[PDB]
């Protein structure tokens, strides 16, 4: 009907369509199975009706609604990227984190978490609203966030962030759900040993703090 995307049947049991001036096949349709004998076109509503060797009919119709919804997605993405940018600019780390998870921007999510700890250094682990958001988090969102925490924990300088998020998840999620989520065991097994490492290192720092105490004791004894 468009006089451009001319169409061809095929006894292989499939249709393929292409622009007349193109010379290369655009779209392939494989509804039918065995053969295909009869092919007809409704013009004013460009509908393709195909009948095969068997007694099965198929009706087909083009859509530009695909283009409309694609443009919808692009518009929505740009809007929410601006939302995230302005959020990191002004505050509202709860909103910023929501959008960062919805878009998957590891830098922006990580900075959000670091700033959240900074402002939360003054039970509660973050802004109460942020904690509620983590509570309402989804399953694939949980797997993505815990993967990110796994990497940030592999690092040495960012384990504070990673541990803080993991603790928040544990205190605001259901352990049955976490065990049940697929792959979660692989993620957790990756996480643990680095956590043990950081545990020991922090312990030794406490020990040296007691060195400082000793210096105090001797100073007082001299005084």
């Amino acid at each position: 009907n468009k006089q451009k995307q001319l169409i061809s049947c095929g006894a292989d049991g499939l249709i393929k369509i292409w622009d007349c001036s193109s010379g290369e096949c655009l779209k392939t349709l494989d509804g039918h199975n065995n053969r295909l004998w009869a092919l007809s076109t409704m013009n004013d509503g460009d509908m393709i009706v195909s009948a095969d060797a068997d007694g099965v009919f198929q009706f087909w119709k083009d859509c530009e609604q695909e283009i409309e919804e694609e443009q919808e997605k692009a518009k929505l993405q740009v809007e929410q990227e601006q939302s995230l940018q302005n959020y990191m600019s002004k505050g509202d780390w709860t909103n910023a984190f929501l959008l960062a998870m919805t878009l998957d921007h590891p830098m922006r999510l990580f900075n959000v978490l670091k700033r959240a700890l900074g402002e939360s250094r003054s039970e509660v682990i973050f802004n109460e609203e942020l904690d509620q958001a983590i509570s309402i988090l989804n399953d694939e969102q949980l797997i993505l966030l815990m993967k990110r925490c796994r990497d940030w924990n592999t690092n040495a300088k960012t384990h504070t962030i990673a541990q803080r998020t993991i603790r928040c998840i544990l205190m605001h999620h259901n352990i049955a759900k976490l065990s049940e989520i697929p792959g979660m065991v692989k993620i957790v097994d990756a996480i643990i040993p680095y956590t043990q490492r950081h545990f020991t290192r922090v312990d030794n720092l406490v020990e040296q703090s007691y060195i400082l105490d000793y210096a105090l004791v001797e100073m007082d004894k001299l005084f």
Binding site: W152, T154, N155
Partner: protein
């Protein structure tokens, strides 16, 4: 578990555990990360 290159084409993940998104990087960041990858691949 070491860490390696990220699975999605939209990201690059360095060794030290940072994960990058190709889109949310600025243009100059794109360029500098580029020149680094280029000199690494040149050394290899």
């Amino acid at each position: 578990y070491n860490v390696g290159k990220a699975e999605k084409d939209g990201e690059i993940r360095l060794k030290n555990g940072v994960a990058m998104s190709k889109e949310e990087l600025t243009r100059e960041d794109k360029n500098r990360l580029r020149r680094a990858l280029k000199r690494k691949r040149s050394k290899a």
